[PDB]
Design a protein around this nucleic acid. Structure first.
Lengths: 377, 132, 63, 100
RNA sequence: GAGACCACCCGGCGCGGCGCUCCUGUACGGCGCAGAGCCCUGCGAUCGCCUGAGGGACGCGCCUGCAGAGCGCGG
RNA sequence: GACCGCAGCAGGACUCCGGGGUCAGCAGCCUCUAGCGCGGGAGCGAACGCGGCUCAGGGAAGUCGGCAAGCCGGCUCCGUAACCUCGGGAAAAGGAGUGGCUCUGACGGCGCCGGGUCAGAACUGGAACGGACGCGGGGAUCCCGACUGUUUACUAGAAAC
């Protein structure tokens, strides 16, 4: 018979299988389109989520209740340490798809990138790249490979590594990723721009701009085996239900005689590769700047580091990018950010009058420890 | 009047709310909410500034009783966040009897009234002693 | 920033934090936290509570 | 060689049922001493047992100061741990006070 | 930061301290020209002061201290 | 603690003696004496189940039905309706107080010397007090059987007998 009452299905079948992410970290998959004839630019950067803040901003959305008013919005700070380019890869759009036409590595590769190539650095041969450094280091070998990329490659990407030493996390191995070079007049112009950046730190300020929208890719927080009420959002049965109420009561009809992939079933709940699109960048700045989070309203020193430090993160020693709103994943989890594929056409101009530097550990009443010292005396 | 911003709807159907106006209604039972599409099993929900269909309680004047009447919620005990980050709440859930055209059955409104109700309904703002 | 003050804690409330309650007395009470609120709701007197600045004024700690 | 080491008994029983606090805490002390004195066998003086169970099975004192002495030789190496009584635990950290 | 077990991500871990911050709400004790009174010159619930104290922490920073990377297995 | 149920079976099976505190209590909650640590141990801290605890705002809209939970509850003093076979209803319904200290009255057997109840007053305390525990939610109706009783051991406790 018919369902009797119309109700939607619970969950997106597109996000199945809901399994633990096999990919180690967030992956970019599709980069933003080249738009040939644009300025040459890097489309992606990797950073580690530090934590959220809350900022007061002036809204200029015309046609709104908040036009010419002030709004307090959640902002996520992602600590983005500079990423050193270590290699250039060129792909060709073959009938079988983008196929690599070889990667040319740098003549000198940093120790954090080397650490990625071994399971344990201390107990290792350390033989990786030994022959390559001998073949290279004159630049002649690298130049020949760059020329081969100009002749046969359609898409140029840079391979860069986050330096983990500049971050508070306990890693030591660097996370290495490919950042598509886009906006090139020619493939060879793209190779030349990439070669200039070889063995050279790249910064978020030189990848992304303030007011621009990004897509944040990362594995989400994990909850382990979960029930269908807390995994698929199904209705808990009445409390009279014997044998428990936290379960889908009917897992299918007599026909088909096999449970369907649609029906909700208990399993892994978190650690899923997700993308949060269209998040606007509130501010890109360095923690080294003392007055980075100071505004005309603040009249104090004010820096990204909150009072008491970032809960479950660390001290964000260097450059950071503060986005608007939440990104996937917990604190410390790597978040690859890319230029938005489909940006929200109508986004309010960013004007920030106040950023919360009060303690996120407990309830903070003071933006800066000097104020706390003065109050207590 | 005008687009509203989603707030936390604290009054489900069955909520009996105090009556702030001098309509001689002591309590207003909440039959339903205007502009409510529904989801299976979801009781209609109402917040400040919303037209709800109410029924005057036994305590109310008999002339007003036994009739389904429109009302605007002007106070709610559920805390709600304005886009400015302000979290506000009222001591009691309240309502004023209003016609869809905004006209108020009672001449005056005794008590504090929320900004959202005052802005959505011009007649509420004019009669409100205070708009917190 | 514009900062109010708790009506019980008597401590400055930074923007975006706390709750306001408007009673039938027509007065908006800004509260630092749930503790500032629950102490007020349960009638507990703030000249009894030591941390509140009202006690500190009374015992000369904050004259 | 003698080691004076503080152990936080409240950290050890965290994550474990409160009925099983004191017997878990005794086991935790042996494992921590095994790491501290690098010995396989740890023998606890009845004083260590009396102190841990002083507040019963549910609540263990927050911290214990322990004097652990390496004894034995030729693979008979063992640790004899006695409870030290200290007025407060302030600037207290492990002391390899024992020589030889 | 991940988990039924596994696996995954990381690794000279980690333990105990010192700061910072936050939680609770002013520690024991001493003192007082506080205390209803009483009967004794003693008792006494309480109160103030020292004391936004004391106690705590699983968050951040640091180490001043013990430490910490198999001649284990495959290969 | 050995009896009888296949068993050293969260199953039954007759009596005798019966301390202390809190309390109206042989209640509940701790303890002296005496007995004693039960067909096993660790690790982990998933779903789910079971035995609980709490939950914003609303308050039965859930459901066949408020099932289950929750509310109420000790004592003292107020204050109690219809109806009635005048006995009841009735703890009707509802309210108010309650802790600790420091005192003041009563009440026997006097010089003496016992009492432990019942009042009354100050002073105190985050606006707290039957602070655990024990411990009615209530009101308006209708049907049926007057009532206390009794019953299908092992699916019907009923309006049946």
């Amino acid at each position: 018979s018919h369902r009797k009452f119309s109700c939607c299905r619970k969950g997106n079948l597109g996000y199945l299988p809901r399994k633990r992410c096999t990919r180690g970290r967030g992956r970019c998959k599709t980069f933003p389109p080249d738009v040939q004839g644009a300025p040459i630019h890097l489309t992606a950067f990797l950073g580690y989520k530090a934590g959220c803040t809350h900022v007061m901003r002036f809204i200029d959305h015309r046609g709104s209740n908040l036009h010419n008013r002030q709004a307090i919005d959640q902002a996520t700070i992602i600590d983005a340490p500079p990423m050193i380019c270590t290699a250039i890869i060129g792909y060709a759009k073959t009938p079988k798809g983008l196929r690599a036409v070889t990667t040319v590595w740098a003549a000198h590769i940093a120790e954090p990138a080397m650490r990625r190539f071994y399971r344990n650095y201390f107990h290792a041969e350390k033989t990786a790249f030994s022959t390559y450094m001998k073949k290279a280091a004159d630049g002649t070998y690298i130049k020949e490979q760059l020329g081969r990329l100009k002749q046969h490659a359609d898409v140029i990407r840079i391979v860069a590594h986050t330096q983990p030493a500049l971050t508070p996390l306990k890693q030591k191995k660097a996370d290495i990723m490919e950042i598509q070079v886009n906006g090139g007049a020619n493939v060879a112009e793209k190779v030349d721009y990439a070669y200039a950046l070889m063995e050279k730190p790249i910064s978020i300020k030189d990848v992304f701009s303030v007011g621009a929208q990004i897509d944040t890719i990362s594995i989400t927080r994990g909850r382990g085996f979960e029930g269908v009420v807390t995994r698929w959002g199904v209705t808990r049965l009445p409390r009279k239900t014997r044998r428990g109420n936290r379960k889908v009561a009917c897992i299918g009809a007599w026909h088909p005689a096999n449970v369907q992939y649609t029906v909700a079933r208990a399993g892994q709940m978190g650690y899923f590769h997700r993308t949060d699109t269209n998040k606007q960048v509130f501010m890109i700045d360095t923690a080294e700047n003392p007055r980075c989070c100071t505004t005309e309203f603040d009249l104090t020193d004010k820096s990204i580091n909150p009072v008491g430090g970032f809960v479950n993160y660390g001290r964000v020693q260097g450059d950071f990018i503060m986005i608007k709103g939440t990104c996937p994943g917990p604190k410390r989890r790597p978040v690859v950010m890319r230029n938005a594929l489909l940006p929200h056409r109508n986004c309010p101009p960013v004007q920030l009058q106040w950023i919360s530097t009060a303690s996120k550990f407990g309830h903070g009443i003071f933006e800066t420890v000097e104020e706390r010292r003065q109050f207590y005396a | 009047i005008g687009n509203k911003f989603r707030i936390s709807c604290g009054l489900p159907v069955g909520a009996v709310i105090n009556c702030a106006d001098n309509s001689g209604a002591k309590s207003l039972n909440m039959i339903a909410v205007k502009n409510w599409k529904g989801h299976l099993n979801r009781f209609p929900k109402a917040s400040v500034g919303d037209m709800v269909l109410i029924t005057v309680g036994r305590d109310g004047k008999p002339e007003l009783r036994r009739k389904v009447t429109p009302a605007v919620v002007v106070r709610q005990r559920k805390v709600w966040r304005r886009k400015d980050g302000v979290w506000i709440y009222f001591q009691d859930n309240a309502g004023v009897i209003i016609n869809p055209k905004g006209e108020l059955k009672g001449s005056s409104i005794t008590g504090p009234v929320a900004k959202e109700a005052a802005d959505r309904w011009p007649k509420i703002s004019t009669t409100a002693e205070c708009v917190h | 920033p514009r900062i109010e003050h708790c009506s019980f804690c008597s401590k400055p409330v930074y923007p975006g934090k706390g709750i306001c309650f408007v009673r039938n007395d027509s007065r908006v009470f800004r509260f630092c936290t749930s503790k500032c609120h629950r102490n007020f709701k349960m009638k507990r007197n703030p000249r009894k509570v030591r941390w509140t600045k009202t006690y500190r004024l009374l015992h000369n700690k904050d004259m | 060689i003698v080691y004076e080491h503080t152990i936080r008994l409240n950290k050890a029983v965290r994550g474990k049922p409160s009925k099983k606090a004191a017997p878990i805490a005794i086991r935790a002390i042996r494992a921590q001493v095994e790491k501290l004195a690098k010995v396989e066998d740890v023998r606890l003086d009845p004083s260590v047992n009396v102190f841990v169970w002083s507040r019963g099975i549910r609540h263990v004192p927050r911290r214990i100061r322990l004097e652990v002495r390496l004894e034995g030789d030729d693979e008979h190496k063992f640790a004899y741990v006695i409870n030290k009584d200290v007025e407060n635990f302030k600037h207290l950290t492990t002391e390899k006070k024992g020589s030889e």
